[PDB]
Amino acid sequence: ELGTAFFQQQQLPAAMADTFLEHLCLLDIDSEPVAARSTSIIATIGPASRSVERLKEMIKAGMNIARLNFSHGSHEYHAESIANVREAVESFAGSPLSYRPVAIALDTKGPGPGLSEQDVRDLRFGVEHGVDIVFASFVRKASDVAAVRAALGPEGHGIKIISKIENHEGVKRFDEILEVSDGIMVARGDLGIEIPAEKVFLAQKMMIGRCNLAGKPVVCATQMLESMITKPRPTRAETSDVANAVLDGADCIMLSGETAKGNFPVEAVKMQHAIAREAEAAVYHRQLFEELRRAAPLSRDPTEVTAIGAVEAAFKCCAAAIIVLTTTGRSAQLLSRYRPRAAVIAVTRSAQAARQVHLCRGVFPLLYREPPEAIWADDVDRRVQFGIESGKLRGFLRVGDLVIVVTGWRPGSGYTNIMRVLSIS
Amino acid sequence: GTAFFQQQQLPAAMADTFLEHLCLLDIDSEPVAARSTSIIATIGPASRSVERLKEMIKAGMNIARLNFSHGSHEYHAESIANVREAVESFAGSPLSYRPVAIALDTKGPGSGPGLSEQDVRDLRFGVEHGVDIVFASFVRKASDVAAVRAALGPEGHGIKIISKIENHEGVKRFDEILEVSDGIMVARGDLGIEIPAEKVFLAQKMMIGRCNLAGKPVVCATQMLESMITKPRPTRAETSDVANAVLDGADCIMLSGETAKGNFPVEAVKMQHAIAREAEAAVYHRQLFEELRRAAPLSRDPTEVTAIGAVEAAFKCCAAAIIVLTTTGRSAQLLSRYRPRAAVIAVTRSAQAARQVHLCRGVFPLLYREPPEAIWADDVDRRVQFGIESGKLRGFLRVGDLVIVVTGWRPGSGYTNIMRVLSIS
Amino acid sequence: RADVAQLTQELGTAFFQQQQLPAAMADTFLEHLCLLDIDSEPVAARSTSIIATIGPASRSVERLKEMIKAGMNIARLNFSHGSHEYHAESIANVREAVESFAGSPLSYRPVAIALDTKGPGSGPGLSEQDVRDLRFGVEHGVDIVFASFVRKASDVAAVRAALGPEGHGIKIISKIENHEGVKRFDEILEVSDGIMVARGDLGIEIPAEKVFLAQKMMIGRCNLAGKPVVCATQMLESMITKPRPTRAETSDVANAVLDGADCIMLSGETAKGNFPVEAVKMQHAIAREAEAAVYHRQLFEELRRAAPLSRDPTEVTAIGAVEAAFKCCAAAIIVLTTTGRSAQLLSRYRPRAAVIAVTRSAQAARQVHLCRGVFPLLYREPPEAIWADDVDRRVQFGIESGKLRGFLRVGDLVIVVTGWRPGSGYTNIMRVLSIS
Amino acid sequence: AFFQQQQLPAAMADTFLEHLCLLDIDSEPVAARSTSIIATIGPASRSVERLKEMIKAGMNIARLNFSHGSHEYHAESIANVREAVESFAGSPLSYRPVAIALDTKGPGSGGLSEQDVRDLRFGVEHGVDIVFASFVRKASDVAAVRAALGPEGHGIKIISKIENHEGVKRFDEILEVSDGIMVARGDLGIEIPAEKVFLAQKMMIGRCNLAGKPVVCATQMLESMITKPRPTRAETSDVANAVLDGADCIMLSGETAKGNFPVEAVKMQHAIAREAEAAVYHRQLFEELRRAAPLSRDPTEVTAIGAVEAAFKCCAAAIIVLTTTGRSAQLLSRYRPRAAVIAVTRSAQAARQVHLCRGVFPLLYREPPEAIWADDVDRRVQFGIESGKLRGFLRVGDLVIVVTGWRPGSGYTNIMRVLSIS
Ligand SMILES: O=S(=O)(NCCc1ccc(S(=O)(=O)c2ccc(O)c(O)c2)cc1)c1ccc(O)c(O)c1
Ligand SMILES: O=S(=O)(NCCc1ccc(S(=O)(=O)c2ccc(O)c(O)c2)cc1)c1ccc(O)c(O)c1
Ligand SMILES: O=P(O)(O)OC[C@H]1O[C@](O)(COP(=O)(O)O)[C@@H](O)[C@@H]1O
Ligand SMILES: O=P(O)(O)OC[C@H]1O[C@](O)(COP(=O)(O)O)[C@@H](O)[C@@H]1O
Ligand SMILES: O=P(O)(O)OC[C@H]1O[C@](O)(COP(=O)(O)O)[C@@H](O)[C@@H]1O
Ligand SMILES: O=P(O)(O)OC[C@H]1O[C@](O)(COP(=O)(O)O)[C@@H](O)[C@@H]1O
Ligand SMILES: O=C([O-])C(=O)[O-]
Ligand SMILES: O=C([O-])C(=O)[O-]
Ligand SMILES: O=C([O-])C(=O)[O-]
Ligand SMILES: O=C([O-])C(=O)[O-]
Ligand SMILES: [K+]
Ligand SMILES: [K+]
Ligand SMILES: [K+]
Ligand SMILES: [K+]
Ligand SMILES: [Mg+2]
Ligand SMILES: [Mg+2]
Ligand SMILES: [Mg+2]
Ligand SMILES: [Mg+2]
């Protein structure tokens, strides 16, 4: 039905292993990855990656989130970077095979007591320019997040706040920070200066583990491919670091100087893309799924209940994708937390949700712009078919495949409760 | 509430090891779930009175067994008529009506090598009288099952054949017999004479294990409550034997002389009911579900994929029930094979399928009698509402419970593909 | 298959087909059940002890010799019936039958004598008849007391006090027979040497459909504590009048062994029935089949995970010896013991290997029958001048007795467990020896 | 306080996910660093005074890269290493043996090259302990290296370097005839796509752990430390992940051979390895190693499993083992005990070679002999205890597992004893 060739690809012999030791022993360099790369790539915009033509090459290479580092540059400089990103993104609104939403994230300069005056002004700039995410620098406690949230004013409550953990206090107060944040960034640069360099891997693994347990995005950042600022190829430690961040459970991986100022910004994005694809196939889903299941408390929320049912069904049939309809991205995030091998294709009418779901591993957003049908059930079927046809066009799906489809019982956010098994025709 | 988590051996259910699970079993933890292992009662002089049969149905009898080793065809036709008269006396309340299957147990081949002439005549009697199940005596190989199937003719294509394993050859050729049978009966009486008495428990445990792995019904039979033929209370070994047959994984438990000729037929049914309810709560679902999922192969059949998704969703939310619409009983059987703690309420229009699904542990059949609605989606919803209303009346459901609803995308058998999370209102 | 390939080439495919070894290698309990085979013959010596109640059907010396040969390890005297004179005669007949085999020290079978008390009756604590019967037990040298209707820790303290300073070595097995005993189980087990799941009264005191829960819970907790647990009452009841038991009875015996019972008991089946010897033979045959069907892979992992870390060298040596025995498919673990404690600590990890306990104490040799898998050998030789040579002689006695008894063959590996100095409490050494 | 140190809350976790969640930057490592450090000797690390600092920093194996330098150059490096090592021999209870490994140039465009034959002969003549054989592609390459060592070099350990696709594909046949493996990531990263090297590393480490044979992770682990005093975030993560993967040894090449911070690079590897060893999830690792190790009738194999099990049961500070060839210590090491394996040996070569096995701390026995063999054994065990107390491995009141044999000579280990310290 699928063939022996299917079961030799994407580390499937290592996937069937009964122990983690046997899983390692069965990893094969000749077993090619087939699934689309699920860990998002955040690229820092700077002199080496500002031009519209360079940004088009970075989008093609795999960049999903453009980071603006507000530690340098004026508001005028960053507004031009935003306009260049949006111009490069919209240049592909013709071909549906190449069009992809790209999120814009603002990284603050940092704190002094309370939020700095420059951070208040930069956060206001972000709201005025429609940024999707804020990477808040030096978050140490829950009140630091509340201050950033308050500065996002009356108009920016939909912006995701990713708290950067950069010091001992942030690590110690991690649980209270994660509870009030949308996600976390393991900011290894400052963290490696604030705590002993030999302890950073413990903080990284702990934070990734806790974010995976909470179902919240976690970004691994800084010096992942550092030598690529001046060299065309990374060191053996650098490729290992990227692979291990993905195996640890990071939703996003980041490039800073590699894309902002280095000589090989596009090559650095290509390298992160190539490593993440290899590492995602090497994940030991048998143990991961069982442990995510065992740790996750019982839930009476139908979205959470449908999500675990859909992920279980996708593993049972080797589903090419899980197509989910989402207004805020939440139904896609709840599927993503169980780490399915199947791609989560999120169909949405919200351009902001489409950009923000790049924070969740394995979510491939599709922005639906067709006008509503008069009959709601027909409008749902048209969006389900839109995900199927986009999936066929991009290579996720073929006729005869099985897909899991996740929808809700009435319009509006918060009513997901249906999982369907569909044969692609 | 805290009271909820003290009942149905929930502290023992949360245990991390089987040893800790045994340590946490509590005699004060009352069973809450409806009894899921079916009771087969043999009909005889002690249980043919229509008024006595009504008491046995109320006590929990699900399948009435006619032992063709004793009595004439005229005697068995009167047994069938009395069973049907007692069963149909409750049809005036469709929300509480309990279907009861009729099983024909053959005399056997005797000194012959294959199907005897008396068995050919008895099987034809069964088809003419509309029996639901055949317990075929002394099945030794796959060709014995084919001969029973041939003797049932074209009119008896829907009858379930449960092969009785009663000797060494049947145990050795078990795999080939199970492959062509609808299920198995561990016929301990003859088996204990054909093989050493001290080895029967090994054959019982092996056969139950293999049937659970195949997703096919398995019946534990003979001398389970033997002393209740003359005494009002069973021995300590007898109550333990019933509990252990349920813990082993038997779908059905049987009564022979206890109901056919003894002085306490109703009390024997009540005792099996009481023990099975206690033993089902003591099942270690944490290990059982993991092992059934791991052993079950990948499937591209949407009914099988929806079944595992629905069972996973039911465990996630502590669903009171899985309501499934079924024509042949197949969708209910595929849910049952994963051993959910949630009751599988099977709503069907087929009176025969309603009787036959008693062979699957945890399937509670409801016979829907209303003619089809003009709009198919309304007819589906009416059947689901009938399941909810029957469930509320019988104590399976309460307002505020979560229920998993399993349906298909079009009319007719074979199209189950939808799982939905529903709150009981 | 790579984890057993070399040992399969060495020991042969026939070795790995016996004693439910394909079911033993299974990765899940479901696959373990699927691989159980009625043609896979048991090889190991029966490890669950059989307690037989002595009565009119089993009191003669000649009948007792047949019961010892059939497998009886513990003789139970039910003090609910019979006078002190009647029970003293039963004790003398048991000792005469047991000593008739003492001529060959290498094959002699010690048999424990257990006194089962009448109980408190309508009273709240220790009755006057129990005080008199317990003093009779001390005066007649009984090894074990099965204390009836234990409801709390003070009930066992009262039994201990009635035994006096002379009965300090007697094992107290508390009988759990009612709701209060089940609810106060933890405090009772803490002060008892073991437990008896007394299903007869328990099945009257609590709903009959709940007894299996109390049995499984108590066996689980005793296995966790490493203390003996006895499953009792109506196991082979129909064998009082019939030569073959019912299908529920053979299942009940097998399930008590699979649950983890150290001992199984016969009451009326041996005390008053028409087939006392056949009932013992049936329990022996079922226990051997059920012991091979135990899923050691999960059981050993769970016993290890649940057992707290220990700084007691006897406990540390015990787990190391059991681990080593599983690694090499050791035929036996030979242990030197004074009180039986080192053998009990090996037994709590449920090795597949027989635990051959070499002791000079006749009482400890009788009492270790309470621990599953312990085969006592009574050493009658006087001590050597050099302690190290005396220890080596005792180990060689175990090997030679094991060879003559069929436990050990040339080429087998055995694990030997000893201590660093004389006296109880100093076990700390494990050795791997090849049988030549 | 005991249960807050060495990641013990994370060690008690019921799942790997919970284990990650409980990792604590404030939980200080207490156990001695188990993963050996191999430092390449070059212009930056050739002086006797420099080598003494590197030994104090944690260097266990000195690597001589025969791709560069003459035989005269390498003989001087060997003499300087031995002079620095022997400067600490005055205190036998604290003396640290250091192995000398010869890394061959390789076959180049060719089987065994003529320069490799000459270099291997040099190694035997100069008493090297280990050979890192370059570009091993099949079992016959190992046989050729073994033949070139001759009858005088029967005791030298051959660690096969896997550097290309053929070596990865023929891994099982190479490991079967080798003493261990080196994941030579430099050439491997050029021979196969750079994004696939982590898969080859994890597979090879897993298979060596399964076989109970040493595995070395090598190349660019702390590359930026050649010119900078601190490594990058990717470099510290790489070292930690090689240890978490299961590497017995970690290596420094240019960082020690030609870089500006050779001592600091050794100190950095030491600090990271200690932190990573405490973060190992022993609960799962021991169960998996135990399950996968085949049944055995070899008493040394049987005693080793029993001793490791007993060490975990009592939180033993150490397993003290008497060994002639190092084999009894290697069989204990394969089960990855948390307890240090203190190997007491009279063989100076075995003391150097057991650095290839994670968690084996060699002690070279040089005390006068005892006339009674039982007394001589007891004295070697007391020597293990005293050196352990002096070095901080043991304290009074600790439990240790002692692994001895029933008669003199190698191959007779069969005894495990539980001993209370002082
Ligand atoms: O299922 S996974 O992809 N886990 C694999 C990672 C892993 C498990 C266990 C160990 S171990 O130290 O026990 C060990 C190390 C090396 C061995 O050879 C060995 O046998 C055992 C190390 C590493 C996963 C990832 C992230 C999670 O949050 C999660 O819940 C599960
Ligand atoms: O390892 S053992 O020898 N026997 C395991 C007995 C057992 C385990 C699990 C279940 S289960 O309900 O999960 C289940 C039932 C039926 C299936 O087919 C299935 O896959 C799973 C039932 C029974 C053992 C005995 C006593 C102990 O105290 C102990 O720690 C371990
Ligand atoms: O993931 P979210 O934000 O809750 O959105 C899920 C919602 O999407 C839907 O599937 C479709 O709703 P709309 O037609 O309003 O887009 C709802 O039925 C469901 O509640
Ligand atoms: O379990 P079965 O026999 O396959 O029946 C399931 C069928 O029942 C339904 O849910 C309802 O079908 P009907 O309207 O024909 O009764 C179908 O959609 C589905 O295919
Ligand atoms: O199991 P116990 O009661 O602790 O006895 C074990 C004891 O037996 C021995 O092996 C032998 O002791 P004895 O010489 O006193 O008989 C002791 O070394 C050890 O302490
Ligand atoms: O690990 P190896 O090489 O097998 O050496 C272990 C040997 O060491 C000993 O413990 C002591 O032997 P020596 O007295 O020869 O040093 C032997 O009993 C044992 O066989
Ligand atoms: O700010 C950052 O990204 C850091 O410190 O690593
Ligand atoms: O026929 C039967 O039911 C039997 O033999 O047990
Ligand atoms: O006393 C007993 O043995 C009982 O009640 O079972
Ligand atoms: O030779 C080496 O060490 C390499 O290639 O990495
Ligand atoms: K910044
Ligand atoms: K019949
Ligand atoms: K009594
Ligand atoms: K070289
Ligand atoms: Mg920073
Ligand atoms: Mg029969
Ligand atoms: Mg009683
Ligand atoms: Mg190289």
Coordinates of N, CA and C in Angstrom, one line a residue, chain C residues 2-7 10-11 16 25-27 295 297-298 300-301 303-305 307-313 315-317 319-321 323-329 349 411-413 415 420 428-434, chain D residues 3 12-15 281 283 286-287 289-307 309-317 334-335 396-399 401 406 413-420:
Chain C
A2 N 19.2 -10.9 19.6 CA 20.6 -10.7 19.8 C 21.0 -10.7 21.3
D3 N 20.1 -10.5 22.2 CA 20.3 -10.5 23.7 C 20.3 -12.0 24.2
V4 N 19.8 -13.0 23.4 CA 19.8 -14.4 23.8 C 20.6 -15.3 22.8
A5 N 21.1 -14.8 21.7 CA 21.7 -15.6 20.6 C 22.9 -16.4 21.1
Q6 N 23.9 -15.9 21.8 CA 25.0 -16.7 22.2 C 24.6 -17.7 23.2
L7 N 23.7 -17.3 24.2 CA 23.3 -18.3 25.2 C 22.4 -19.4 24.6
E10 N 24.8 -21.9 23.0 CA 25.4 -22.7 24.1 C 24.5 -23.6 24.8
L11 N 23.3 -23.1 25.2 CA 22.4 -24.0 26.0 C 21.4 -24.8 25.1
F16 N 15.6 -23.1 25.7 CA 14.8 -21.8 25.6 C 13.3 -22.1 25.2
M25 N 10.7 -13.7 27.6 CA 11.5 -12.7 26.8 C 10.6 -11.7 26.2
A26 N 9.3 -11.8 26.3 CA 8.4 -10.8 25.7 C 8.6 -9.4 26.2
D27 N 8.4 -8.4 25.3 CA 8.5 -7.0 25.6 C 7.4 -6.4 26.3
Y295 N 5.7 -13.1 34.9 CA 6.4 -12.2 33.9 C 7.5 -11.5 34.6
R297 N 10.4 -10.2 33.8 CA 10.9 -9.0 33.3 C 10.2 -7.7 33.9
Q298 N 8.8 -7.7 33.9 CA 8.2 -6.6 34.5 C 8.2 -6.6 36.1
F300 N 10.5 -7.9 38.2 CA 11.8 -7.5 38.7 C 12.0 -6.0 38.6
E301 N 11.7 -5.4 37.4 CA 11.8 -4.0 37.3 C 10.9 -3.2 38.3
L303 N 9.7 -4.3 41.3 CA 10.2 -4.6 42.6 C 11.5 -3.7 42.9
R304 N 12.3 -3.5 41.9 CA 13.5 -2.6 42.0 C 13.1 -1.1 42.1
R305 N 12.2 -0.7 41.2 CA 11.7 0.7 41.2 C 11.0 1.1 42.5
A307 N 11.3 -0.5 45.5 CA 12.1 -0.7 46.7 C 13.0 0.6 46.9
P308 N 12.9 1.1 48.2 CA 13.7 2.3 48.5 C 15.2 1.9 48.5
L309 N 16.1 2.9 48.3 CA 17.5 2.7 48.4 C 17.9 2.2 49.8
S310 N 18.9 1.3 49.9 CA 19.2 0.7 51.1 C 20.7 0.8 51.4
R311 N 21.0 1.0 52.7 CA 22.4 1.0 53.1 C 22.7 -0.3 53.9
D312 N 21.8 -1.3 53.9 CA 22.0 -2.5 54.6 C 22.7 -3.5 53.6
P313 N 23.9 -3.9 54.0 CA 24.7 -4.7 53.0 C 24.0 -6.0 52.6
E315 N 20.7 -6.4 52.1 CA 19.8 -6.0 51.1 C 20.5 -5.7 49.8
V316 N 21.6 -5.0 49.8 CA 22.4 -4.6 48.7 C 23.0 -5.8 48.0
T317 N 23.5 -6.8 48.8 CA 24.0 -8.0 48.2 C 22.9 -8.8 47.5
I319 N 20.1 -7.8 46.0 CA 19.7 -7.4 44.7 C 20.8 -7.6 43.7
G320 N 22.0 -7.5 44.1 CA 23.1 -7.8 43.2 C 23.2 -9.2 42.8
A321 N 22.9 -10.2 43.7 CA 22.9 -11.6 43.5 C 21.7 -12.0 42.6
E323 N 20.2 -10.0 40.4 CA 20.5 -9.4 39.1 C 21.5 -10.3 38.3
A324 N 22.6 -10.8 39.0 CA 23.6 -11.7 38.5 C 22.9 -13.0 38.0
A325 N 22.0 -13.6 38.9 CA 21.4 -14.8 38.5 C 20.5 -14.7 37.2
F326 N 19.8 -13.6 37.1 CA 19.0 -13.4 35.8 C 20.0 -13.3 34.6
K327 N 21.1 -12.6 34.8 CA 22.0 -12.4 33.7 C 22.6 -13.6 33.1
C328 N 22.8 -14.7 33.9 CA 23.5 -15.9 33.5 C 22.6 -17.1 33.5
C329 N 21.3 -16.9 33.8 CA 20.3 -18.0 33.9 C 20.8 -19.0 34.9
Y349 N 13.0 -10.3 45.8 CA 13.2 -9.9 44.4 C 12.7 -10.9 43.4
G411 N 28.6 -27.6 34.5 CA 28.5 -26.5 33.5 C 27.6 -25.4 33.9
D412 N 26.7 -25.6 34.9 CA 25.8 -24.5 35.4 C 26.6 -23.4 36.1
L413 N 26.0 -22.2 36.2 CA 26.5 -21.2 37.0 C 25.6 -21.1 38.2
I415 N 25.2 -18.7 42.0 CA 25.6 -17.4 42.7 C 25.7 -17.8 44.2
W420 N 31.1 -11.6 56.0 CA 32.5 -11.3 56.2 C 32.9 -11.8 57.6
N428 N 27.4 -9.9 53.0 CA 27.9 -8.8 52.2 C 28.7 -9.3 51.0
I429 N 28.7 -10.6 50.7 CA 29.5 -11.1 49.5 C 28.7 -11.9 48.5
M430 N 28.9 -11.7 47.3 CA 28.3 -12.4 46.2 C 29.4 -13.0 45.3
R431 N 29.4 -14.3 45.0 CA 30.4 -14.9 44.1 C 29.7 -15.7 43.0
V432 N 30.3 -15.7 41.8 CA 29.8 -16.4 40.6 C 30.7 -17.7 40.5
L433 N 30.1 -18.9 40.6 CA 30.9 -20.1 40.6 C 30.4 -21.0 39.4
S434 N 31.3 -21.7 38.7 CA 31.0 -22.6 37.7 C 30.9 -24.0 38.3
Chain D
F3 N 20.7 15.4 48.5 CA 19.7 15.1 47.5 C 19.4 16.4 46.6
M12 N 15.7 11.5 39.9 CA 14.5 10.8 40.4 C 13.3 10.8 39.6
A13 N 13.3 11.7 38.5 CA 12.1 11.9 37.6 C 11.6 10.6 37.0
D14 N 10.3 10.6 36.8 CA 9.6 9.4 36.3 C 9.6 9.3 34.7
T15 N 9.8 10.5 34.1 CA 9.9 10.5 32.6 C 11.1 11.4 32.2
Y281 N 20.4 10.8 32.4 CA 19.2 10.3 33.0 C 19.4 8.8 33.3
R283 N 18.2 6.6 35.3 CA 17.1 5.7 35.4 C 16.7 5.0 34.1
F286 N 20.4 3.1 32.5 CA 20.7 1.8 33.1 C 19.7 0.7 32.6
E287 N 18.4 1.0 32.7 CA 17.4 0.1 32.2 C 17.7 -0.4 30.8
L289 N 20.5 -0.1 28.9 CA 21.8 -0.9 28.8 C 21.7 -2.3 29.3
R290 N 21.0 -2.4 30.5 CA 20.8 -3.7 31.1 C 19.9 -4.6 30.2
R291 N 18.8 -4.1 29.7 CA 17.9 -4.9 28.8 C 18.7 -5.3 27.5
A292 N 19.4 -4.4 26.9 CA 20.1 -4.7 25.7 C 21.4 -5.6 25.8
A293 N 22.1 -5.6 27.0 CA 23.3 -6.5 27.2 C 22.8 -7.9 27.1
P294 N 23.5 -8.8 26.3 CA 23.0 -10.2 26.2 C 23.2 -11.0 27.4
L295 N 22.5 -12.1 27.6 CA 22.7 -13.0 28.7 C 24.2 -13.6 28.6
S296 N 24.8 -13.8 29.7 CA 26.2 -14.3 29.6 C 26.5 -15.3 30.7
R297 N 27.4 -16.2 30.3 CA 27.9 -17.1 31.3 C 29.4 -16.9 31.7
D298 N 29.9 -15.7 31.4 CA 31.2 -15.2 31.7 C 31.1 -14.6 33.1
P299 N 31.8 -15.2 34.1 CA 31.7 -14.7 35.5 C 32.1 -13.2 35.7
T300 N 33.0 -12.7 34.8 CA 33.4 -11.3 34.9 C 32.1 -10.4 34.5
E301 N 31.4 -10.8 33.4 CA 30.2 -10.1 32.9 C 29.1 -10.2 33.9
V302 N 28.9 -11.3 34.6 CA 27.9 -11.6 35.6 C 28.2 -10.7 36.8
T303 N 29.4 -10.7 37.3 CA 29.8 -10.0 38.5 C 29.6 -8.5 38.2
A304 N 30.0 -8.0 37.0 CA 29.9 -6.6 36.7 C 28.5 -6.0 36.8
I305 N 27.5 -6.7 36.2 CA 26.1 -6.3 36.3 C 25.6 -6.3 37.7
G306 N 26.0 -7.3 38.5 CA 25.6 -7.4 39.9 C 26.2 -6.3 40.7
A307 N 27.5 -5.9 40.5 CA 28.1 -4.8 41.2 C 27.5 -3.5 40.8
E309 N 24.4 -2.9 39.8 CA 23.1 -3.0 40.4 C 23.2 -2.6 41.9
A310 N 24.1 -3.3 42.6 CA 24.3 -3.1 44.0 C 24.8 -1.6 44.3
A311 N 25.6 -1.0 43.4 CA 26.1 0.3 43.6 C 24.9 1.3 43.5
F312 N 24.0 1.1 42.6 CA 22.8 2.0 42.5 C 21.9 1.8 43.7
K313 N 21.7 0.6 44.1 CA 20.9 0.3 45.3 C 21.3 1.1 46.6
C314 N 22.6 1.2 46.8 CA 23.0 1.9 48.0 C 23.6 3.3 47.8
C315 N 23.6 3.8 46.6 CA 24.2 5.1 46.3 C 25.7 5.0 46.6
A316 N 26.4 3.9 46.2 CA 27.8 3.7 46.5 C 28.6 4.8 46.0
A317 N 29.6 5.2 46.8 CA 30.5 6.3 46.3 C 31.4 5.8 45.2
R334 N 30.7 -0.2 31.2 CA 29.7 -0.4 30.1 C 28.2 -0.2 30.6
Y335 N 28.0 -0.4 31.9 CA 26.7 -0.2 32.5 C 26.4 1.2 33.0
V396 N 34.3 8.5 55.4 CA 34.0 7.5 56.4 C 32.4 7.4 56.4
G397 N 31.9 6.2 56.5 CA 30.5 6.0 56.4 C 29.9 5.7 55.1
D398 N 30.7 6.0 54.0 CA 30.2 5.6 52.6 C 30.2 4.1 52.4
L399 N 29.4 3.7 51.5 CA 29.4 2.3 51.1 C 30.2 2.2 49.7
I401 N 31.5 -0.8 46.7 CA 31.4 -2.2 46.1 C 32.8 -2.6 45.8
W406 N 38.9 -15.0 42.2 CA 39.1 -16.1 43.1 C 40.6 -16.7 43.1
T413 N 37.8 -12.7 37.5 CA 36.9 -11.9 38.4 C 35.6 -12.6 38.6
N414 N 35.1 -12.7 39.8 CA 33.9 -13.4 40.1 C 33.3 -13.0 41.5
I415 N 33.8 -12.0 42.1 CA 33.4 -11.7 43.5 C 33.0 -10.2 43.6
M416 N 31.9 -9.9 44.3 CA 31.5 -8.6 44.6 C 31.2 -8.5 46.1
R417 N 31.7 -7.5 46.8 CA 31.5 -7.4 48.3 C 31.0 -5.9 48.6
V418 N 30.2 -5.8 49.6 CA 29.7 -4.5 50.0 C 30.4 -4.1 51.3
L419 N 31.2 -3.0 51.2 CA 32.1 -2.6 52.3 C 31.7 -1.2 52.8
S420 N 31.7 -1.0 54.1 CA 31.5 0.2 54.7 C 32.9 0.9 55.0

